């Protein structure tokens, strides 16, 4: 059982990227992927940085399974990040504040000003949080090919290698 939701990264967020974001030394495995350039690369650096921070973050996020996937916004400029996450410390009450706190903590090092993302939990119109995160990964997120999917990070055993494999995602 994993929760899921979406954050937005507007173009104004990308306008505020500092040189530590742009000149990141992170080299990402694109040997089975489309090239990562311009703001697509920035987004890929951010997800990798968020993933690395989460790996070493405890409290409510300790032991959590996560699957992050960033994609372009089809009608407007910018991006959205698909967040599938669950764990023993996470629950419908602290989900938003923990996810938002994590993504904004990492983001703060990469922007010149104060810019804050909003996490919108996947839920019914009566407020029941979605718990179909695993199914959402398998039926939807993993079926996208680059650059419909821009970048992806996960710690889930089923996808550690496949998540950034264009060949896997095609078949």
Numbering used by the authors: 2 to 172
Sentences copied from the publication:
The nuclease domain of NS1 (NS1_Nuc) is responsible for DNA Ori binding and nicking that is critical for B19V viral DNA replication.
Different from the Form I structure, there are two NS1_Nuc molecules within the asymmetric unit of the Form II structure. Superposition showed that the overall folding of NS1_Nuc is very similar in the two structures; the root mean square deviation (RMSD) value is 0.8 Å, based on 169 pairs of Cα atoms. Compared to the Form II structure, Glu77 is shifted about 7.3 Å in the Form I structure. As observed in the Form I and Form II NS1_Nuc structures, Leu121 can adopt two different conformations, but neither are compatible with A-5 in the WDV Rep/ssDNA complex structure. Different from Arg94, both Lys127 and Lys129 can undergo subtle conformational changes.
